[PDB]
PDB file of C-alpha atoms and ligand atoms in Angstrom:
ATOM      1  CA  UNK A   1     -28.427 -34.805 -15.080  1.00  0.00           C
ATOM      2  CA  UNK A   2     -24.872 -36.248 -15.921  1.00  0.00           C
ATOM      3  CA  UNK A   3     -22.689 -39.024 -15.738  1.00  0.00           C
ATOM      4  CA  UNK A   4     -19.433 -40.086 -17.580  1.00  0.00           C
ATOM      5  CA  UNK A   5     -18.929 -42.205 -20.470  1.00  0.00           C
ATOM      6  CA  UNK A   6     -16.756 -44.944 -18.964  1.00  0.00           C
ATOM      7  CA  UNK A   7     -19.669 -45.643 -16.269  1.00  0.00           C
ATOM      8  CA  UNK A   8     -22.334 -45.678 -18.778  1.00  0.00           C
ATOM      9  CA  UNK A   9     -20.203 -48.055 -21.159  1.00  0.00           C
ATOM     10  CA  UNK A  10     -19.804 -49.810 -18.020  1.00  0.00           C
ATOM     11  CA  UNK A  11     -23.041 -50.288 -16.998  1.00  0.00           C
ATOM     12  CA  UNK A  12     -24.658 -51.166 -20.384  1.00  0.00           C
ATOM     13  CA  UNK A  13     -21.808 -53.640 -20.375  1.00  0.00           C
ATOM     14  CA  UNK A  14     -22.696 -55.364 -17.331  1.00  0.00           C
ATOM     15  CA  UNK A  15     -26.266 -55.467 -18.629  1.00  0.00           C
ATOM     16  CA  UNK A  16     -25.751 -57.096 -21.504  1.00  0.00           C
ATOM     17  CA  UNK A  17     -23.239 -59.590 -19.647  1.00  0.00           C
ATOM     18  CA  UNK A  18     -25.763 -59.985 -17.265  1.00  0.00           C
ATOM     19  CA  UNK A  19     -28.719 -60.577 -19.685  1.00  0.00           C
ATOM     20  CA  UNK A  20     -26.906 -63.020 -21.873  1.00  0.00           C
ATOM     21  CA  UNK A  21     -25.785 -65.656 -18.877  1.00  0.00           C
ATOM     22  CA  UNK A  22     -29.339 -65.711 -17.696  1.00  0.00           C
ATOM     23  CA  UNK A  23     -30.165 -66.474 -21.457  1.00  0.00           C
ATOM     24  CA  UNK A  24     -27.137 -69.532 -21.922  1.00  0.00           C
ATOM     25  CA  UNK A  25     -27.675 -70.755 -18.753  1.00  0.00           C
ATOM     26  CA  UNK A  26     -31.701 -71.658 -18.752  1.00  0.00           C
ATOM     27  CA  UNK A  27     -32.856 -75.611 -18.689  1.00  0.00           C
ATOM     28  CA  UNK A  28     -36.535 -74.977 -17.800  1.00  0.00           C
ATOM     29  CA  UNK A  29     -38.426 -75.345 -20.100  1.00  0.00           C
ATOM     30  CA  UNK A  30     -39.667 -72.744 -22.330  1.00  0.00           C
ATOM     31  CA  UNK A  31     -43.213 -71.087 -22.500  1.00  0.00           C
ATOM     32  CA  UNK A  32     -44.095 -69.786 -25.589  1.00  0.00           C
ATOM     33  CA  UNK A  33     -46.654 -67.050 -25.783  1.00  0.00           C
ATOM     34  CA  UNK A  34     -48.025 -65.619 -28.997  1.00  0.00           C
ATOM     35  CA  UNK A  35     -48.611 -61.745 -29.473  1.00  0.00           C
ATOM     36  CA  UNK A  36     -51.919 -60.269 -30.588  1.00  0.00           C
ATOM     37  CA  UNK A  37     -49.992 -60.529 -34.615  1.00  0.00           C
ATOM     38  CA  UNK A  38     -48.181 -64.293 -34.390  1.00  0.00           C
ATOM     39  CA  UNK A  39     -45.070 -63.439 -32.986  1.00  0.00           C
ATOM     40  CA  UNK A  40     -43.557 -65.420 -30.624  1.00  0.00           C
ATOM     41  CA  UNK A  41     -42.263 -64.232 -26.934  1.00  0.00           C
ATOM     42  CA  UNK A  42     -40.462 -66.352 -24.121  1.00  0.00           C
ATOM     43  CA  UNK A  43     -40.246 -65.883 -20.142  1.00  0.00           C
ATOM     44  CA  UNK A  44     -36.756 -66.371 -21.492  1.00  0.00           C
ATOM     45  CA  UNK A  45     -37.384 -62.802 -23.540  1.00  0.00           C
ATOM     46  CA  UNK A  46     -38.799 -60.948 -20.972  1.00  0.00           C
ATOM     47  CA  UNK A  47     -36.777 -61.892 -18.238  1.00  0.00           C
ATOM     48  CA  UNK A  48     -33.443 -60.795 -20.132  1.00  0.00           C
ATOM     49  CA  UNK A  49     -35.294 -57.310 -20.401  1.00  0.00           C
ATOM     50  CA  UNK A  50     -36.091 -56.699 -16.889  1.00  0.00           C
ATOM     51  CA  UNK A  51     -32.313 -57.780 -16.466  1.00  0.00           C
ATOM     52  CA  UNK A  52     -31.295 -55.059 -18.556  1.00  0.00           C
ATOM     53  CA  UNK A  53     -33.497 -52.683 -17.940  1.00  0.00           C
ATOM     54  CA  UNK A  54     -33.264 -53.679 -13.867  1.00  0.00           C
ATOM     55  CA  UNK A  55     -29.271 -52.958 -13.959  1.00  0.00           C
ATOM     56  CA  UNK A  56     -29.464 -49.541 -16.300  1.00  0.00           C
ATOM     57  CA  UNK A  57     -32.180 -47.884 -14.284  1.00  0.00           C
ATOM     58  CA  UNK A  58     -30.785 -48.281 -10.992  1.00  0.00           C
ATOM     59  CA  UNK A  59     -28.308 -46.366 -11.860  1.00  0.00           C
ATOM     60  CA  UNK A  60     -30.099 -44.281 -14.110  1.00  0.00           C
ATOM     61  CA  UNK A  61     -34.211 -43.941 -13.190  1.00  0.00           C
ATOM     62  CA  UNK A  62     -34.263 -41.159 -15.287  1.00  0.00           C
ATOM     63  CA  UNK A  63     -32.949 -42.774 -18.359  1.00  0.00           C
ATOM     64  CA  UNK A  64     -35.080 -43.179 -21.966  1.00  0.00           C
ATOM     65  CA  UNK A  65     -35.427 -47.144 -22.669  1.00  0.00           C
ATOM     66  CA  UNK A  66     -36.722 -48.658 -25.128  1.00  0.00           C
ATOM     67  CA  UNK A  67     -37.483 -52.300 -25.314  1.00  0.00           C
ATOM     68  CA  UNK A  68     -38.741 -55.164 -27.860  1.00  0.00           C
ATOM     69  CA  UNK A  69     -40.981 -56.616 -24.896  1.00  0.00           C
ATOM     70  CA  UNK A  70     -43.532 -55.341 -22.674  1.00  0.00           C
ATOM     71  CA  UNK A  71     -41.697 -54.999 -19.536  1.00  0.00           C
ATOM     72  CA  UNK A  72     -39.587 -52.735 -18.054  1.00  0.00           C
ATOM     73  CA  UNK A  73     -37.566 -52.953 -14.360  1.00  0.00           C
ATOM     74  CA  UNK A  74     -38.324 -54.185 -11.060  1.00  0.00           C
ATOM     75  CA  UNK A  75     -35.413 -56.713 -10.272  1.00  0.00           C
ATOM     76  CA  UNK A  76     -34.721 -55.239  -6.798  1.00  0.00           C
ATOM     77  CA  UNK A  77     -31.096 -53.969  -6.488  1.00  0.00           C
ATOM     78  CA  UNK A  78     -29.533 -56.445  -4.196  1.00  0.00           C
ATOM     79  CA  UNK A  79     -30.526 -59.399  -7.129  1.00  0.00           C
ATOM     80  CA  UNK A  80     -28.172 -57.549  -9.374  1.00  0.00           C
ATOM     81  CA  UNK A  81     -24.284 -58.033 -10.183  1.00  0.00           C
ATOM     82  CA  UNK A  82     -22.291 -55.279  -9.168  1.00  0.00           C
ATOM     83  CA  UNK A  83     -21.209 -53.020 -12.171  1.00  0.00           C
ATOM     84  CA  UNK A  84     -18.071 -53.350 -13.792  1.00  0.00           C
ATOM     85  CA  UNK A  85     -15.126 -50.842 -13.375  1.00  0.00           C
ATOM     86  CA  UNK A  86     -13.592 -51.221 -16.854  1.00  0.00           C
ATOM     87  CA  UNK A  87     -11.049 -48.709 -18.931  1.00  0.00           C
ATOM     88  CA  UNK A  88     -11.708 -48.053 -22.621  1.00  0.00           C
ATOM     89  CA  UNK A  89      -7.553 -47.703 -23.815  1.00  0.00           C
ATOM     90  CA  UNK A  90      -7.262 -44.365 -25.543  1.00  0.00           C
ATOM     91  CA  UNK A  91     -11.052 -43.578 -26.160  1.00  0.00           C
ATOM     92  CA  UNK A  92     -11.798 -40.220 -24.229  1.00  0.00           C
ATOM     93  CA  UNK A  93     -14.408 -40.272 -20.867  1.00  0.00           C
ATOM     94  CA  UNK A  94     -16.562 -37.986 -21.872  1.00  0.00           C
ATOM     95  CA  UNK A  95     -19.378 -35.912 -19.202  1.00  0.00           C
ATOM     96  CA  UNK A  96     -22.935 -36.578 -21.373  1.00  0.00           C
ATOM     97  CA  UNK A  97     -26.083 -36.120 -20.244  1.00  0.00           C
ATOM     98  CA  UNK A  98     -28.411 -38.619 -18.958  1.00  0.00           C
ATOM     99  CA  UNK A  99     -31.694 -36.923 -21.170  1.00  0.00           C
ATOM    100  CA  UNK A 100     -29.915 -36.858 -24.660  1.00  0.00           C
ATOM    101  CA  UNK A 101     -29.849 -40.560 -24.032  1.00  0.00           C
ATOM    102  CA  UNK A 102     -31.921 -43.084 -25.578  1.00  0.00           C
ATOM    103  CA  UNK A 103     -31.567 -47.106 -25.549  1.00  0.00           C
ATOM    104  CA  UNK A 104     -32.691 -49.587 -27.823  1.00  0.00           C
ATOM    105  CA  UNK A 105     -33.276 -52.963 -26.373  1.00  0.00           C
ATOM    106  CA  UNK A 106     -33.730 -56.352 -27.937  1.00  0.00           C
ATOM    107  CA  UNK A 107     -33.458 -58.624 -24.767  1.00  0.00           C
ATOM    108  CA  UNK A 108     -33.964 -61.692 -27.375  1.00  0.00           C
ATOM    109  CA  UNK A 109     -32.858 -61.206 -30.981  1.00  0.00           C
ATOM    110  CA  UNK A 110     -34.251 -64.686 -32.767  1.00  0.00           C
ATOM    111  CA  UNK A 111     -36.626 -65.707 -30.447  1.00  0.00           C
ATOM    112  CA  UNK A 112     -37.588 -68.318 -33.164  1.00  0.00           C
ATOM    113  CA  UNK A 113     -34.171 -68.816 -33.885  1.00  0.00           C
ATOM    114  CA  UNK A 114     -34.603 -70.228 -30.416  1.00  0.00           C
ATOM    115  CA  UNK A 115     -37.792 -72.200 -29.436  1.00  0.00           C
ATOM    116  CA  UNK A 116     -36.313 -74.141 -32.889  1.00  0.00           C
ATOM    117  CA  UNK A 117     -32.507 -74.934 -31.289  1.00  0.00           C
ATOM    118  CA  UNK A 118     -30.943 -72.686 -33.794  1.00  0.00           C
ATOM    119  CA  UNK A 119     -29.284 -71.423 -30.865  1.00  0.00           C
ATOM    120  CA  UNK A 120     -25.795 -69.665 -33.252  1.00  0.00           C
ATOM    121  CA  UNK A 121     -28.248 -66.972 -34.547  1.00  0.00           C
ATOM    122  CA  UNK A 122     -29.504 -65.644 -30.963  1.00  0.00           C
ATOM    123  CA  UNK A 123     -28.687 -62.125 -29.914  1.00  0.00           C
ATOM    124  CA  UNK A 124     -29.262 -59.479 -27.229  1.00  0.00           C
ATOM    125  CA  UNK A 125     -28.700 -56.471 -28.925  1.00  0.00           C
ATOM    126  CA  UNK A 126     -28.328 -52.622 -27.155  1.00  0.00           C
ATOM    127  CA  UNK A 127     -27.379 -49.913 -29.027  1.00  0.00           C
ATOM    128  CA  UNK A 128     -27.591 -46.193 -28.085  1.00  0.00           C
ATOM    129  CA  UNK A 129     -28.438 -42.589 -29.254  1.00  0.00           C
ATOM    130  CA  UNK A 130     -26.900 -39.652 -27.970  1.00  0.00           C
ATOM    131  CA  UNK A 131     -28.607 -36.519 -29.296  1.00  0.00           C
ATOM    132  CA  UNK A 132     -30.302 -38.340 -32.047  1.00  0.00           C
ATOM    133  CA  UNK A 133     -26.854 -39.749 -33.290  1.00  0.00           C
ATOM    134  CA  UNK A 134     -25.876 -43.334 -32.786  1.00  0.00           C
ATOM    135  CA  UNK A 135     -23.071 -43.464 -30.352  1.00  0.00           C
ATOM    136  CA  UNK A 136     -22.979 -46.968 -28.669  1.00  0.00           C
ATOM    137  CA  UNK A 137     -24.101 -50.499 -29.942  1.00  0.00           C
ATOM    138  CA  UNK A 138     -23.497 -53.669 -27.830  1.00  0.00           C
ATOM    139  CA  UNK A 139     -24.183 -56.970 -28.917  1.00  0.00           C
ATOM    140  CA  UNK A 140     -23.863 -60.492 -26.876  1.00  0.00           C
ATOM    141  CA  UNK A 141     -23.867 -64.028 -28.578  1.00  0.00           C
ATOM    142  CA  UNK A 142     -25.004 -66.334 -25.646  1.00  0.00           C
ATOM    143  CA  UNK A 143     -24.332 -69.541 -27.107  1.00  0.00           C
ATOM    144  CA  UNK A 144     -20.787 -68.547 -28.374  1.00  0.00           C
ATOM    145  CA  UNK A 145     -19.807 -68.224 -24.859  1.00  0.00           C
ATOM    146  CA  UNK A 146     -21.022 -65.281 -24.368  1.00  0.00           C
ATOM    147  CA  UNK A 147     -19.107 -63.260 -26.841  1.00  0.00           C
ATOM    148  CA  UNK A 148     -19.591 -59.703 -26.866  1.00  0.00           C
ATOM    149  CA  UNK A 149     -18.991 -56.894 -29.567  1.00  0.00           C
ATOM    150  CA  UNK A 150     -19.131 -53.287 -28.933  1.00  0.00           C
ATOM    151  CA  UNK A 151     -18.308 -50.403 -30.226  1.00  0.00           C
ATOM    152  CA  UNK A 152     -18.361 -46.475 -28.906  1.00  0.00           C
ATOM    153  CA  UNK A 153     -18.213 -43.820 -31.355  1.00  0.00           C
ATOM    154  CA  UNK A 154     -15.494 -45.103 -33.808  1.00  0.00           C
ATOM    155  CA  UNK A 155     -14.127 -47.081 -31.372  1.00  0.00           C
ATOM    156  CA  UNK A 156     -14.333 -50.935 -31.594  1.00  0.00           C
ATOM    157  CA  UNK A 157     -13.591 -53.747 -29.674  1.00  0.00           C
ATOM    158  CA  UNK A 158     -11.785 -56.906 -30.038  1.00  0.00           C
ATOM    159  CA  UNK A 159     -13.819 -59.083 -33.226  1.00  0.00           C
ATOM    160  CA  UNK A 160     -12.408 -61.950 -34.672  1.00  0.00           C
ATOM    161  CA  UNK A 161     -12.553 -61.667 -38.457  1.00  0.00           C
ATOM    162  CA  UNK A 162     -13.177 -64.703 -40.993  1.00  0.00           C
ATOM    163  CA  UNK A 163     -10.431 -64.324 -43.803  1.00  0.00           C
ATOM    164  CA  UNK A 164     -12.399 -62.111 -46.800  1.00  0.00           C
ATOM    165  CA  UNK A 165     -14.367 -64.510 -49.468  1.00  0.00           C
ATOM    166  CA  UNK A 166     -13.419 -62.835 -52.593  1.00  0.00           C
ATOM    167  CA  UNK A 167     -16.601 -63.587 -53.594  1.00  0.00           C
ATOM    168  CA  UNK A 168     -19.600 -61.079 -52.573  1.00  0.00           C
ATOM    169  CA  UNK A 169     -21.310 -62.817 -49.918  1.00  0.00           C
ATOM    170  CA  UNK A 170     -24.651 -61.619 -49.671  1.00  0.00           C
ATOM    171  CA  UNK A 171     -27.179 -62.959 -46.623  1.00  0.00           C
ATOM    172  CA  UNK A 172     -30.397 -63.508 -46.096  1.00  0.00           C
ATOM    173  CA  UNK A 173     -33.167 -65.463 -44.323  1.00  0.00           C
ATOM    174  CA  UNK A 174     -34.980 -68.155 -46.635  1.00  0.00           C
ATOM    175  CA  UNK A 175     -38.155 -66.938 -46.070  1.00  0.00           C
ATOM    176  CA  UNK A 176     -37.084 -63.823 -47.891  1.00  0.00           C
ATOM    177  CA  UNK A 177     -34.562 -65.050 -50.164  1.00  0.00           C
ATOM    178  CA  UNK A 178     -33.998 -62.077 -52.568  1.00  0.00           C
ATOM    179  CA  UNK A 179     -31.356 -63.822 -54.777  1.00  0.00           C
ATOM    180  CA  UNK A 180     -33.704 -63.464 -57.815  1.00  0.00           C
ATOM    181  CA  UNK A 181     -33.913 -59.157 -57.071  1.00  0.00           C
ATOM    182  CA  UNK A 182     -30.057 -59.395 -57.417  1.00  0.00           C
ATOM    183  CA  UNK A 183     -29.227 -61.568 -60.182  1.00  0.00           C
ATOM    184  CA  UNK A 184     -27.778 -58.140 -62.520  1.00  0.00           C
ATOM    185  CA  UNK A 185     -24.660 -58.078 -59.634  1.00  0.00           C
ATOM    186  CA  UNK A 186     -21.375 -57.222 -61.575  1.00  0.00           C
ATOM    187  CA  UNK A 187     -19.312 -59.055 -59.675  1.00  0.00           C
ATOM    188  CA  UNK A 188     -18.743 -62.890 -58.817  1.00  0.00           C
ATOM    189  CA  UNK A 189     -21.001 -63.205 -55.825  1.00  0.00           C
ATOM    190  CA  UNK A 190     -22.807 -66.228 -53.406  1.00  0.00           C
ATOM    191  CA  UNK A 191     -25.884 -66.242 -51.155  1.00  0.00           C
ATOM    192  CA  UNK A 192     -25.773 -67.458 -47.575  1.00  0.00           C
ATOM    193  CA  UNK A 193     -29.020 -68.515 -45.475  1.00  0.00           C
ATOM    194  CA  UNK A 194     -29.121 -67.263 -42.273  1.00  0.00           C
ATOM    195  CA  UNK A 195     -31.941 -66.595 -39.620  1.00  0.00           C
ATOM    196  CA  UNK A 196     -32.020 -63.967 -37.081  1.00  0.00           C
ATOM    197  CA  UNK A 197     -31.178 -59.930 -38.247  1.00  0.00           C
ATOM    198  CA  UNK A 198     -28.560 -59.483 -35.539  1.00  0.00           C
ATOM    199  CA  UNK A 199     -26.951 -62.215 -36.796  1.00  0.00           C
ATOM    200  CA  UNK A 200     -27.427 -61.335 -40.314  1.00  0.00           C
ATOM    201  CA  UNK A 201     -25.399 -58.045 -39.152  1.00  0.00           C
ATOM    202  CA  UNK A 202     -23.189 -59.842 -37.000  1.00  0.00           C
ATOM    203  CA  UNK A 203     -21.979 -61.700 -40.215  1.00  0.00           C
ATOM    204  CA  UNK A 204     -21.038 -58.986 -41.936  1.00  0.00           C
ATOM    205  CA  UNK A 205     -18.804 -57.714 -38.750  1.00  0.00           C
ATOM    206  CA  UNK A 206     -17.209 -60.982 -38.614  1.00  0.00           C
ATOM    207  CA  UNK A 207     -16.700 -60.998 -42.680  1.00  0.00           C
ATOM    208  CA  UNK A 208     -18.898 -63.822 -42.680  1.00  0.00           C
ATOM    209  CA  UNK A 209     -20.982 -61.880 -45.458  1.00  0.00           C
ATOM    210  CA  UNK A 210     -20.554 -58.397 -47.700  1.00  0.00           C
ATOM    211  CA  UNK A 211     -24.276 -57.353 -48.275  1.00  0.00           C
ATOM    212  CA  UNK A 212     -27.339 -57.777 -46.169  1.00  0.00           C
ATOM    213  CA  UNK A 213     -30.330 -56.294 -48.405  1.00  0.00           C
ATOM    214  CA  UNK A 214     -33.708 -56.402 -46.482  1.00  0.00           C
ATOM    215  CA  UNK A 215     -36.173 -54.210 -48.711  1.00  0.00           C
ATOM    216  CA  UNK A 216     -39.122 -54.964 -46.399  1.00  0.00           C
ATOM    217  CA  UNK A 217     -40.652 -53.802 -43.271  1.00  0.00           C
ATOM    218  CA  UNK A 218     -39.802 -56.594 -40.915  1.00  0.00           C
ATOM    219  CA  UNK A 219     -37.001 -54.474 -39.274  1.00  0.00           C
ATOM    220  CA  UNK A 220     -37.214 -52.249 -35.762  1.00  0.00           C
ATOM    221  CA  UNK A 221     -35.046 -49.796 -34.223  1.00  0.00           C
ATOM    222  CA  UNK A 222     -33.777 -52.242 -31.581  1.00  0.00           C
ATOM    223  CA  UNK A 223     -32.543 -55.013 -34.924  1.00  0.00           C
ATOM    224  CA  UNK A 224     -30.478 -52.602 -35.900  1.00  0.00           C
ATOM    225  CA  UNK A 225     -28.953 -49.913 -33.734  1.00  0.00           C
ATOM    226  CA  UNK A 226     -26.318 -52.070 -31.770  1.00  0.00           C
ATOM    227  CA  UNK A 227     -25.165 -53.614 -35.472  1.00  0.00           C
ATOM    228  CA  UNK A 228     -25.122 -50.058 -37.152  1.00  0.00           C
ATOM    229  CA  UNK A 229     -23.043 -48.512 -34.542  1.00  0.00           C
ATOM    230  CA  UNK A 230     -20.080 -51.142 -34.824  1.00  0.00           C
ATOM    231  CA  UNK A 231     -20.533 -51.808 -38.433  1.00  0.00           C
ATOM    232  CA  UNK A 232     -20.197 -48.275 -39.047  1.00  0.00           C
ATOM    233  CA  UNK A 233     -17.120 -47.815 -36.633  1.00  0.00           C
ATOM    234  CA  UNK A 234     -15.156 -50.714 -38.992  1.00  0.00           C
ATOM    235  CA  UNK A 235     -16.473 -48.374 -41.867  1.00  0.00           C
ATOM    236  CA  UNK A 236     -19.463 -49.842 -43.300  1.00  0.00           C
ATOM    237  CA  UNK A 237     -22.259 -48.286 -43.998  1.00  0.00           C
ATOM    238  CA  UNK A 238     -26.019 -48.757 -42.696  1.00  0.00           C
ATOM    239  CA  UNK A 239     -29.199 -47.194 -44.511  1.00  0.00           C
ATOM    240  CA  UNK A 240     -32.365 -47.553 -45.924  1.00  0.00           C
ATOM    241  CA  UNK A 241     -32.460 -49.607 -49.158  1.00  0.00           C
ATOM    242  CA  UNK A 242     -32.624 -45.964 -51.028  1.00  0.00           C
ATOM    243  CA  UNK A 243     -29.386 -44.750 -49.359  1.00  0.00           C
ATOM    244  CA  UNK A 244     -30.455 -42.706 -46.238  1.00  0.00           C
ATOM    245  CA  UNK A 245     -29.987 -42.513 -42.658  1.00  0.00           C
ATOM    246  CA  UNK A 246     -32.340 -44.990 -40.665  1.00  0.00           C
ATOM    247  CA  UNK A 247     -34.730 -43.507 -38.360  1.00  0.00           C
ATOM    248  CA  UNK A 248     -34.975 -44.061 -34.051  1.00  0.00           C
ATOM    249  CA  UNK A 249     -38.002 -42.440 -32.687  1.00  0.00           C
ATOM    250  CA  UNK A 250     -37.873 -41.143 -29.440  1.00  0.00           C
ATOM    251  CA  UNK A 251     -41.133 -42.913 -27.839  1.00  0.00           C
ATOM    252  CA  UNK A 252     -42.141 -46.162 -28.006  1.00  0.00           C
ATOM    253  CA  UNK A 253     -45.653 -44.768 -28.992  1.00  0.00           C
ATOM    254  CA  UNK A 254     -44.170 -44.234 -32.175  1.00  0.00           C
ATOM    255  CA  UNK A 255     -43.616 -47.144 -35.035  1.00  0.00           C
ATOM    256  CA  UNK A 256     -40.339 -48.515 -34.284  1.00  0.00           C
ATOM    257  CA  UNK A 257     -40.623 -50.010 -37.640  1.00  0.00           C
ATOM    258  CA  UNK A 258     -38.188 -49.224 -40.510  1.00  0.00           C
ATOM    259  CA  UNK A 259     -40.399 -48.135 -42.942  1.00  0.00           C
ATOM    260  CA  UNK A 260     -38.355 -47.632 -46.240  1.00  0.00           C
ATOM    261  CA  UNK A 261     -35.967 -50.803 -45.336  1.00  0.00           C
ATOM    262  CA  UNK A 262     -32.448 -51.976 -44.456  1.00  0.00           C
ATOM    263  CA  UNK A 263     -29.162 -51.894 -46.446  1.00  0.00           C
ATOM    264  CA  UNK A 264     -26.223 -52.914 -44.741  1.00  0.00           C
ATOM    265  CA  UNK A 265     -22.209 -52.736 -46.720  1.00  0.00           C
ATOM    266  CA  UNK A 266     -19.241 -54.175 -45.499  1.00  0.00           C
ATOM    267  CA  UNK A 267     -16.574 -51.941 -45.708  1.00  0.00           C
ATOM    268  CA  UNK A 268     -14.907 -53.636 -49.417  1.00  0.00           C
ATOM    269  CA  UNK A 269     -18.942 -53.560 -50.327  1.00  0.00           C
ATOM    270  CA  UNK A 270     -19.694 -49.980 -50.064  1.00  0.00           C
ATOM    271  CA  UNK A 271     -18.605 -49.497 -53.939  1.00  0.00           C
ATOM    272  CA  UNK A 272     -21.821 -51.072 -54.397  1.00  0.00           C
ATOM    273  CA  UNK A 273     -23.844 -48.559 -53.105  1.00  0.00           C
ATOM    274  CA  UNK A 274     -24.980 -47.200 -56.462  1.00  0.00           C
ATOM    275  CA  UNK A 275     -26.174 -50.363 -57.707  1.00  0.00           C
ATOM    276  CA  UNK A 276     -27.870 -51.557 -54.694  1.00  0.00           C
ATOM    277  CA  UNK A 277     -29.663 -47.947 -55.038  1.00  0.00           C
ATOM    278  CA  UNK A 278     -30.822 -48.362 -58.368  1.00  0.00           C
ATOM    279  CA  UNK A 279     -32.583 -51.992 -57.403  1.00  0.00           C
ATOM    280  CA  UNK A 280     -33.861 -50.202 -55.293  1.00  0.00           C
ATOM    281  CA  UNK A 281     -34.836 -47.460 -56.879  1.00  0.00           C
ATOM    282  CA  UNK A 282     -38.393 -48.854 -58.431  1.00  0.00           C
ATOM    283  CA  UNK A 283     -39.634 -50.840 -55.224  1.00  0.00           C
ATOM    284  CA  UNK A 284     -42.116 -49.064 -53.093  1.00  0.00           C
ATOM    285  CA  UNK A 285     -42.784 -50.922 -49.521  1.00  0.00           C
ATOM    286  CA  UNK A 286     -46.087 -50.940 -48.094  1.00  0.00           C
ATOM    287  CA  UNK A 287     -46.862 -52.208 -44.673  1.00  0.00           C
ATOM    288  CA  UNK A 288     -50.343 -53.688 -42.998  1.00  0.00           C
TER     289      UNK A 288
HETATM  290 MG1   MG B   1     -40.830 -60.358 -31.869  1.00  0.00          MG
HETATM  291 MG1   MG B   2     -36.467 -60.177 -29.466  1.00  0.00          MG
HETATM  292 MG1   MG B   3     -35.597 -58.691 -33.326  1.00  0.00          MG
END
């Protein structure tokens, strides 16, 4: 029923490390199946998933998972790395139980990112509730050696920060370039192009980019969690696109979809709130 905080950090840590090398170091060459609604999926996606969810549920078969793809464990225990027996500084190693857990997996964030070499906008992305409330979020850039963020609670690890714009950098994919929805913004401001939503988020970490405005329902739990929990731990702020908390259903049967979109503030950006709110203020998303 319980474990400590330090060997669930650590675990989810090795994970992630674990997923990510298998995802950098790959040369076969790539399958590329297409889901029942266009989307593409990898061997390369699937077998990062049973990675992580291989390592996690060894040590934890009673753990709530939830994952992007339609796999879950297997990978027999003696085919995994040994877990790592890291300290966490001054953050306190808490007792928390195993069933107010649940873990939001993207094994593959940009999966189109990668079957077209843009290899700087892949992600694996976990992040992690802990009685409904965001708690953990871990995120792994393969190809940038295999840099990982995390953060627990408001506790964040190392991040290497761009020096701030002084412009507002705002970021979004081409394909839904909203530069035209924002062309009222006070302030002196650019637009970046960039595909993939973890990296999208990742940017803003990194002071790459200020806003990342995504009034749509493209988004899922698993895009966002990891992001949300570090981002908010720098003091940024994560929502909907009309201000409130994003939702993480429990089950899997459940939309994982975020229905009433993203909004995500660097921590100079969150002045901006208001504005951003009254944009969005007159758009009502529907989905198909
Ligand atoms: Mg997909
Ligand atoms: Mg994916
Ligand atoms: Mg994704």
């Amino acid at each position: 029923m319980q474990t400590s905080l330090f060997e669930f950090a650590n675990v989810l840590i090795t994970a992630v490390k674990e997923a990510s090398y298998s995802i950098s170091k790959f040369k076969e060459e790539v399958e590329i199946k297409y889901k029942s609604d266009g989307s593409e999926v990898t061997q390369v996606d699937t077998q990062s998933q049973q990675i992580i969810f291989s390592i996690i549920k060894n040590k934890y078969p009673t753990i709530n998972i939830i994952g992007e793809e339609d796999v879950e464990n297997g990978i027999p225990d003696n085919q995994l790395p040994t877990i790592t027996q890291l300290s966490f500084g001054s953050l306190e190693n808490k007792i928390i139980n195993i069933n107010d857990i649940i873990i939001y997996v993207d094994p593959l964030d940009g999966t189109d990112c990668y079957t077209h070499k843009q290899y700087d906008s892949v992600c694996v992305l976990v992040g992690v509730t802990y009685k409904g409330k965001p708690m953990i979020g871990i995120v792994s850039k393969p190809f940038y050696n295999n840099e990982i963020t995390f953060a627990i609670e408001n506790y964040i690890s190392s991040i290497s920060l761009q020096p701030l714009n002084d412009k507002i950098i705002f970021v979004c994919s081409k394909k839904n370039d909203i530069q035209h929805l924002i062309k009222s913004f006070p302030d002196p401001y650019e637009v970046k192009y960039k595909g993939g939503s973890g990296a999208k988020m990742m940017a803003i970490i990194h002071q790459e980019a200020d806003i990342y405005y995504h009034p749509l329902i493209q988004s899922c739990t698993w895009d966002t969690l990891a992001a949300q929990v570090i981002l908010e731990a720098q003091g940024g702020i994560v929502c909907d696109i009309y201000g409130n908390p994003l939702c993480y259903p429990s089950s899997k049967k459940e939309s994982m979809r975020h229905k009433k979109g993203v909004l995500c503030l660097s921590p100079r950006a969150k002045k901006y709130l208001p504005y951003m709110l009254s944009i969005s203020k007159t758009i009502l998303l529907l989905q198909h």
